[PDB]
Every structure is written in C-alpha cells, then in structure tokens.
Paper text:
Cellular retinol-binding protein 1 (CRBP1) is the primary transporter of all-trans-retinol (atROL) in the eye, and its inhibition has recently been shown to protect mouse retinas from light-induced retinal damage. We determine binding affinities for the newly identified compounds and elucidate mechanisms of their interaction with the protein by solving high-resolution X-ray structures of human CRBP1 in complex with selected inhibitors. Consistent with the fluorescence data, all of the crystallized compounds acted as competitive inhibitors of CRBP1, occupying the same binding site as atROL.
Three of the newly identified inhibitors of CRBP1 are structurally related by containing a 1,2,4-oxadiazol ring (inhibitors 1–3). The common feature of these compounds is the substitution of the oxadiazol ring at position 3 with a bulky moiety such as 4-methylphenyl cyclopentyl (inhibitors 1 and 2) or diphenylmethyl (inhibitor 3). In inhibitor 2, an alternative hydrogen bond is observed between the oxygen atom of the oxadiazole ring and two ordered water molecules. Interestingly, the presence of an N-ethyl group in inhibitor 2, induces an alternative conformation of this molecule in the binding site, which no longer supports hydrogen bonding of the tertiary amine group. Another characteristic interaction site is observed for inhibitors 2 and 6, involving the N(2) nitrogen of their pyrazole rings. In ligand 2, a hydrogen bond is formed between N(2) and an ordered water molecule, which is further stabilized by its interactions with the side chain of T53. It is noteworthy that inhibitor 2, 3, and 5 exhibit a greater propensity to stabilize the α-helices I/II region in comparison to compounds 1, 4, and 6. Additionally, it is interesting to note that certain nonretinoid ligands have the potential to enhance conformational flexibility in segments of CRBP1 that remain well-structured even in the protein’s apo form.
Author numbering: 2 to 136
The structure:
C-alpha cells in the first residue's frame, strides 16, 4: 500500500470531542475544528514522513515503521507518547503509549481516499482526504 502524495480534507467527523478527550480547552477546540488541513506523505521504504499542513500549525511526523519513537505532541495536547506505527495488512496502525488509554490511529486507502480514524479513551474521530495534484 503506498500513501505517498498530497491529500486534501473532505470530511472531519467528531474532531471536537476527540480533542475534548485530550483536555484541549473549548476555545482551542473551535479554532482547531475550523481548520481543513492537507496531508503530504512520502513513504520511502519503511521510512515515512506525514506532514499535516494548516495555516494554524503544521504537525510533522517522521519515523520508521515498526520502531518505537518518542512523539512530541507539543502545541497539540502538550503530551509526549512512546509511539509505534506498524503495518497491519493494508492498514497503517499507530499506538501512542502514554497518559491516555487507547490512544492511536489507523490509516488506509480506498480508491482516491485516504482514511484516518483517530482514537482516544473510546472517543473516535473519522477523517477522509482526497488525493490531489495541485502542489
Ligand atoms: C491530533 C493529532 N494530530 C495529528 C493527526 N495525525 C494522525 C496521524 C498523523 N497525524 C491530528 C491533527 N492535528 C491537527 C492540527 C492541530 C493543532 C492543534 C490542535 C489543538 C489540534 C490539532 C491542526 C492541523 C495540524 C495540527 N489537526 O489534526
């Protein structure tokens, strides 16, 4: 499965409640949920870069599949997790070990759609991106 490419947000479902489970204050939840970030992904063997781009903040992930790393979520919920992103078939599975239970996410492709399900303490956000070519 190859996530490389540029992706534009199409839907973002239940993001504010996901952020509330992360204890993001209400004012910042509304700022964040107005945003419609793009994703720019380069998959280079097991080395993956996922850039989440917005006018408010760019959040960059840069990691090796299968290897645990210290993920610095400053500027988001201001926590740090020990994170591992691994192949589960044609799905990319992320586990973020930390203060919060059941924190992680799942990423996969359907057609020209990138699907992202983000989870924490049973709360679930679903996002869908379309593959785009204007860069
Ligand atoms: C909440 C975890 N981040 C990373 C998502 N992700 C999943 C796999 C790789 N990254 C999701 C996300 N952050 C964001 C941004 C963001 C920034 C300030 C807050 C309080 C919330 C969200 C705005 C656009 C980029 C930063 N928008 O969505």
């Amino acid at each position: 499965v190859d996530f490389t490419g540029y992706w534009k947000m199409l839907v973002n479902e239940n993001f504010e409640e996901y952020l509330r489970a992360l204890d993001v204050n209400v004012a910042l939840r509304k700022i964040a949920n107005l945003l419609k970030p793009d994703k720019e992904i380069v998959q280079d063997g097991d080395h993956m870069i996922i850039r989440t781009l917005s006018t408010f903040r760019n959040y960059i992930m840069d990691f090796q599949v299968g290897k645990e790393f210290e993920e610095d979520l400053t500027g988001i919920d201001d926590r740090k997790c020990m994170t591992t992103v691994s192949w589960d078939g044609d799905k990319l599975q992320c586990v973020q070990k930390g203060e919060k239970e059941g924190r992680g996410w799942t990423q996969w492709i359907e057609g020209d759609e990138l699907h992202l399900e983000m989870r924490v303490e049973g709360v679930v956000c679903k996002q869908v991106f379309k593959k785009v070519q204007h860069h």
